[PDB]
Amino acid sequence: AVQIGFLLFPEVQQLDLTGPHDVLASLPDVQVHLIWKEPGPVVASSGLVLQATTSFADCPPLDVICIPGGTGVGALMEDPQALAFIRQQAARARYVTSVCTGSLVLGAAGLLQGKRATTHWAYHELLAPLGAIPVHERVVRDGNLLTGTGITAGIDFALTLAAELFDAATAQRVQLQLEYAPAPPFNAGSPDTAPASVVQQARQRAADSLHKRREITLRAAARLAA
Amino acid sequence: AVQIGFLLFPEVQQLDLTGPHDVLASLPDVQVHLIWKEPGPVVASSGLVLQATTSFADCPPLDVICIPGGTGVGALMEDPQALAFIRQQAARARYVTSVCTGSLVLGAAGLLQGKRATTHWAYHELLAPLGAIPVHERVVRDGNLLTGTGITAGIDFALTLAAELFDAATAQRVQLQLEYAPAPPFNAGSPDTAPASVVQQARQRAADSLHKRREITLRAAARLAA
């Protein structure tokens, strides 16, 4: 069975995780894990309560690891237990993936050094201090690393993973079974297509978080420099 | 505060729910409820464990009700307590919505009689016996009823709801904050675009479920005829 694991942490953006989870759990001969320090409840940033299924110590060797984003990323960037777990699993995983600000966690773990990567548009400046080559594209691949942007990036890249782990016909069948054919009613999903007034509002609302994450990123980079 | 409720039932397709939940929970002055017979754990069809937050009896009057789909829809179509709750809330709700096979639950509750509606492609034949006018479109509106197809239909229609409950600029801001701009790597999300061989496989895999749901639908229709 292919072993797929998601890191589940307090203040995760749950859709970053629950999207790819439901797609990948639809495949044959896959086992999906929700990993935290111990099994039990974990609260997402919206208040939705999820349940981790395994601890770091009990998790099997993973074929795919996926790091979601969210408010909670700042704490995770300075959690030595979580960063060590991610490094251990990434050493042998066939695919190391992240959604949105989850790539900042990969960065803090040292896994973006010299690698092309993306992250959420409002935090993109934090990639270079973590050693990455920043790329402004929605899905960026570099070897076995896949980083994606957007709350639903993992739905789209889960179909790519399905095609490579199995075959294209299997990926197409899952897409059809889920009737997955998005059609957003607005075109404001990128700072390059949204109205300037909307970009300003979004930037202002993210400013305090960006300021705090600049501080965290510099400490994380100092640890990588040692 | 706008009151938004999702029905959370055993064997739900969790993404049908978790997608619109995370979008709508991002809005100001909204309270989101996960409703079942009592608060506590509810297991989705993938094994993901979610937590209902309120009972039928304690739920406030809702401005928006959303019925997700999933394997578990068959039981819900013959659950008199759930159907009565849906009818009660729909009487005063500003919006009555469903994702995928959730519209079959609205049908069993009597809320599609004489109304244009859609559902998952493999189950579309079950709409007419429930009194609906079947429509092969991804989002179908009829008055205050919105029915959508695809596991992520609620993400897209949640942006429409945001624009009508608030304004277009608010919907655009949420879209940008979430960096929501999907780009599926395959084009097999409809039986009209998928390869014929893939459509056959998907139809064969759904056949036992369709057969059981034909039987349930006829019993549900008999209750509406009384």
Side-chain angles (χ1 to χ4, degrees):
Chain A
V2 178
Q3 300 294 316
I4 301 184
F6 296 89
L7 200 66
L8 173 55
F9 53 88
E11 262 67 53
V12 65
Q13 183 89 59
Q14 60 84 6
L15 183 52
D16 288 11
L17 183 157
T18 61
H21 186 284
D22 227 6
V23 175
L24 292 167
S26 298
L27 293 168
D29 308 322
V30 173
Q31 186 166 357
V32 182
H33 303 271
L34 300 169
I35 305 149
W36 190 231
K37 298 190 175 167
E38 298 291 337
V42 179
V43 181
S45 65
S46 66
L48 188 74
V49 183
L50 297 172
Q51 213 75 201
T53 63
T54 183
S55 70
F56 295 156
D58 292 332
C59 187
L62 297 173
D63 300 296
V64 177
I65 187 166
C66 181
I67 314 302
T71 303
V73 156
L76 214 62
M77 287 174 74
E78 305 192 276
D79 185 327
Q81 298 192 315
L83 299 175
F85 173 81
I86 295 166
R87 285 193 288 263
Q88 182 197 9
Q89 289 285 354
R92 284 198 76 264
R94 297 167 63 183
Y95 297 96
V96 177
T97 73
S98 64
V99 179
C100 194
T101 51
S103 55
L104 299 179
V105 181
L106 295 179
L111 295 169
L112 301 183
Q113 291 179 105
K115 307 295 180 154
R116 297 173 62 252
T118 192
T119 196
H120 185 281
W121 67 270
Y123 301 91
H124 213 271
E125 68 181 82
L126 301 177
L127 290 168
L130 300 167
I133 298 167
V135 177
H136 296 275
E137 289 171 26
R138 175 158 183 281
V139 175
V140 178
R141 304 189 66 169
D142 192 332
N144 70 340
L145 177 65
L146 287 78
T147 61
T149 66
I151 193 162
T152 65
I155 297 175
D156 289 330
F157 75 60
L159 294 172
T160 294
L161 296 184
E164 297 186 4
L165 289 164
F166 298 96
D167 51 41
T170 295
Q172 289 172 321
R173 188 182 59 254
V174 171
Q175 188 184 13
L176 178 61
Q177 287 179 339
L178 303 179
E179 201 166 5
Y180 174 63
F186 297 95
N187 192 37
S190 162
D192 296 325
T193 62
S197 55
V198 172
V199 176
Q200 180 68 27
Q201 287 274 19
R203 277 206 198 278
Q204 262 195 316
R205 279 154 189 270
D208 289 338
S209 176
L210 177 61
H211 186 263
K212 183 69 237 199
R213 288 177 175 176
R214 285 188 182 115
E215 174 193 345
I216 293 164
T217 296
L218 290 167
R219 285 198 293 270
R223 294 179 186 109
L224 298 177
Chain B
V2 178
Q3 300 294 316
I4 301 184
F6 296 89
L7 200 66
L8 173 55
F9 53 88
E11 262 67 53
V12 65
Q13 183 89 59
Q14 60 84 6
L15 183 52
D16 288 11
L17 183 157
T18 61
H21 186 284
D22 227 6
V23 175
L24 292 167
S26 298
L27 293 168
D29 308 322
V30 173
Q31 186 166 357
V32 182
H33 303 271
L34 300 169
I35 305 149
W36 190 231
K37 298 190 175 167
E38 298 291 337
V42 179
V43 181
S45 65
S46 66
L48 188 74
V49 183
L50 297 172
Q51 213 75 201
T53 63
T54 183
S55 70
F56 295 156
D58 292 332
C59 187
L62 297 173
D63 300 296
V64 177
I65 187 166
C66 181
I67 314 302
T71 303
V73 156
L76 214 62
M77 287 174 74
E78 305 192 276
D79 185 327
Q81 298 192 315
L83 299 175
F85 173 81
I86 295 166
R87 285 193 288 263
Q88 182 197 9
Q89 289 285 354
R92 284 198 76 264
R94 297 167 63 183
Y95 297 96
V96 177
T97 73
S98 64
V99 179
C100 194
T101 51
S103 55
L104 299 179
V105 181
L106 295 179
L111 295 169
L112 301 183
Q113 291 179 105
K115 307 295 180 154
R116 297 173 62 252
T118 192
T119 196
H120 185 281
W121 67 270
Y123 301 91
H124 213 271
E125 68 181 82
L126 301 177
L127 290 168
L130 300 167
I133 298 167
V135 177
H136 296 275
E137 289 171 26
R138 175 158 183 281
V139 175
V140 178
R141 304 189 66 169
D142 192 332
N144 70 340
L145 177 65
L146 287 78
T147 61
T149 66
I151 193 162
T152 65
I155 297 175
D156 289 330
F157 75 60
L159 294 172
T160 294
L161 296 184
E164 297 186 4
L165 289 164
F166 298 96
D167 51 41
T170 295
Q172 289 172 321
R173 188 182 59 254
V174 171
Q175 188 184 13
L176 178 61
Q177 287 179 339
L178 303 179
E179 201 166 5
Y180 174 63
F186 297 95
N187 192 37
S190 162
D192 296 325
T193 62
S197 55
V198 172
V199 176
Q200 180 68 27
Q201 287 274 19
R203 277 206 198 278
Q204 262 195 316
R205 279 154 189 270
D208 289 338
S209 176
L210 177 61
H211 186 263
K212 183 69 237 199
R213 288 177 175 176
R214 285 188 182 115
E215 174 193 345
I216 293 164
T217 296
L218 290 167
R219 285 198 293 270
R223 294 179 186 109
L224 298 177

